[PDB]
Amino acid sequence: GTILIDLSPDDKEFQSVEEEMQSTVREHRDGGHAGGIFNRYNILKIQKVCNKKLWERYTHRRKEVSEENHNHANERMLFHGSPFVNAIIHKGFDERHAYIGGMFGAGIYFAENSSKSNQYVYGIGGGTGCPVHKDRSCYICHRQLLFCRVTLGKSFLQFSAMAHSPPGHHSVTGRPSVNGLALAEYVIYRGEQAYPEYLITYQIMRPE
Numbered sequence: 001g002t003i004l005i006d007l008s009p010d011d012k013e014f015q016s017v018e019e020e021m022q023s024t025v026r027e028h029r030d031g032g033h034a035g036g037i038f039n040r041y042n043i044l045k046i047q048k049v050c051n052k053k054l055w056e057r058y059t060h061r062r063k064e065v066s067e068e069n070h071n072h073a074n075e076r077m078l079f080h081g082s083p084f085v086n087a088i089i090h091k092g093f094d095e096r097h098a099y100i101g102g103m104f105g106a107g108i109y110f111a112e113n114s115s116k117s118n119q120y121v122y123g124i125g126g127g128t129g130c131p132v133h134k135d136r137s138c139y140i141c142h143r144q145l146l147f148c149r150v151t152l153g154k155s156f157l158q159f160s161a162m163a164h165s166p167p168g169h170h171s172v173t174g175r176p177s178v179n180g181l182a183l184a185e186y187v188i189y190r191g192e193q194a195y196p197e198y199l200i201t202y203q204i205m206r207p208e
């Protein structure tokens, strides 16, 4: 059901997605261990992910959440990094894309910082890095992230140093309370609360 439409670099939509990618890079407390050392990306391709069934599954759930939260879906665009991007774009998010050992429980995790999601492209903690070179800081191999539409509804705020949402909530927000430069991370517990809208293919760039 899924088709991928390549966006032109001249398209305003390509440019706005690239800017969110680039502008939300930060340094990480692991010195680059999980995701590599870089300050910016080389964006190689941005594709719009188009699947009618998956979209309608998303909007159906979005309406339910909205009606439970004074007509406010609390929809965000957030990054997701996974070695299972291909299953996600074809079959959608589900319990198999949950992070069982995550700090907010077994749910599906999303980041405001693209560089946070980049730490997960090759697995938890970056796995063993790229398939070809076993390098978590590989500057050659092509990486992919998803930029996703995510329904948060009423989000449980966790001040921060498949399962179920906290009762009376539709998601969890992990608010950073130590690292002043970190942006928030979010967890949903229903795969239908996210749609993988853009597939971004990129390399991390070696600092000059």
Ligand SMILES: Cc1c[nH]c(=O)c2cccc(N)c12
Binding pocket: 079, 080, 081, 082, 099, 102, 109, 110, 111, 116, 117, 118, 120, 185, 186
């Ligand atoms: C676990 C995980 C996977 N993919 C992500 O993009 C992500 C983003 C923020 C926090 C996480 N824990 C994750």
Ligand SMILES: [Zn+2]
Binding pocket: 130, 131, 132, 133, 134, 135, 138, 139, 140, 141
């Ligand atoms: Zn490599």
